[PDB]
């Protein structure tokens, strides 16, 4: 029966570990690459998925004042990224740069 | 002296020792008064103690300065409250409400059997562990001294040793008799005593 083959389970678990590694690798690249524009997000939000979603909702720090991060982050965390946005260290990036990091 | 005061005031059921020392009676009463109101909604009977135990004037009532007759009336009122609070220990507001009695009337020092007997069926509940820490065990409850200030809650086997103690059975009998006359018995109390009352052959 196609539903009683064990070779898939050994297959999936190996794939599952591989997906964890590659997803982790791309995550750090997003941290440093977007960190150039706004370096202190990594310290605030540690989760990779939450980190990426913030970039999607807001591409640039200027958007921090009006954009809402409630669905991604709790109240105390979302305000911390907003305060960081205005006092941020990073340099501005072009829309061409923003398109790819998105 | 000050050292006696900090031990008495540090004891708490909601807060740790350091914060408990900093707190004042009024702040405790404010939370307890709100807690009693919630208990009043669940059962109307809890509104009764608002006139006597959770009154604003109770903030100025000190048991040490009272006479013997006044203490007996005070003890009886504390006795009644623990019975009604016996079934509702699972609810959070009861813990806040009982904090005022612990902090103001020192029930953990004086009415210690009455407090322990009421919550005997919550022995795995974390509230019972907090009780054991802030309470000096009577000589009948010496079996529980091991679990005082211990990570592990008391085990069911340890209940069997304590519960069947004859002079404690006569103690628990009267407590169970008090519940029956007042119709305060509930299933968890009946189940805990029954499960014991079969293992109370030990």
């Amino acid at each position: 029966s196609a539903d009683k083959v064990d070779v898939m389970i050994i297959q999936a678990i190996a794939l599952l570990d591989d997906l964890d590694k590659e997803l982790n690798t791309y995550a750090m690249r997003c941290k440093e690459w977007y960190g150039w524009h706004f370096p202190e997000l990594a310290k605030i939000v540690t989760d990779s998925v939450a980190y990426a979603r913030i970039i999607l909702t807001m591409g640039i720090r200027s958007k921090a004042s009006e954009t809402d991060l409630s669905e991604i982050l709790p109240e105390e965390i979302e305000e911390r990224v907003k305060t960081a946005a205005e006092v941020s260290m990073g340099t501005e990036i072009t829309q061409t740069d923003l398109d790819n990091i998105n | 002296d000050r050292k006696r005061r900090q031990k008495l005031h540090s004891a708490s059921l909601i807060y740790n020792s350091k914060t408990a020392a900093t707190q004042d009676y009024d702040f405790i009463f404010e939370n307890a008064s709100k807690a009693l109101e919630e208990l009043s909604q669940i059962e109307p009977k809890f509104a009764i103690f608002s006139r006597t135990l959770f009154s604003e004037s109770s903030i100025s009532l000190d048991r040490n300065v009272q006479t013997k007759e006044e203490i007996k009336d005070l003890d009886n009122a504390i006795n009644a409250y623990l019975l009604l609070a016996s079934s509702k220990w699972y609810l959070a507001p009861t813990l806040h409400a009982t904090e005022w009695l612990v902090r103001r009337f020192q029930i953990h020092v004086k009415n210690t059997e009455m407090l322990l007997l009421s919550t005997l069926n919550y022995y795995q509940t974390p509230v019972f562990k907090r009780i054991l820490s802030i309470i000096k065990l009577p000589p009948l409850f010496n079996c529980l001294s091991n679990f005082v200030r211990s990570e592990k809650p008391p085990t069911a086997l340890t209940m069997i040793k304590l519960f069947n103690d004859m002079d404690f059975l006569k103690l628990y009998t009267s407590y169970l008799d008090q519940c029956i006359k007042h119709n305060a018995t509930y299933t968890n109390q009946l189940l805990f005593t029954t499960c014991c009352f079969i293992n109370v052959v030990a």
Binding site: - | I48, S58, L61, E70, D73, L74, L84, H182
Partner: protein, 34 residues
């Protein structure tokens, strides 16, 4: 002349009187509560 009720309530707060509570304690009847 005797004080008014609102004075008596005011007097209770300032002087920290506990007699009214003590009377309620004496009148406490366990049967009524249960």
């Amino acid at each position: 002349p005797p004080p008014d009720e609102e004075e008596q309530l005011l007097a209770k707060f300032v002087f920290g009187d506990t007699t009214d509570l003590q009377e309620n304690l004496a009148k406490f009847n366990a049967d009524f509560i249960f």
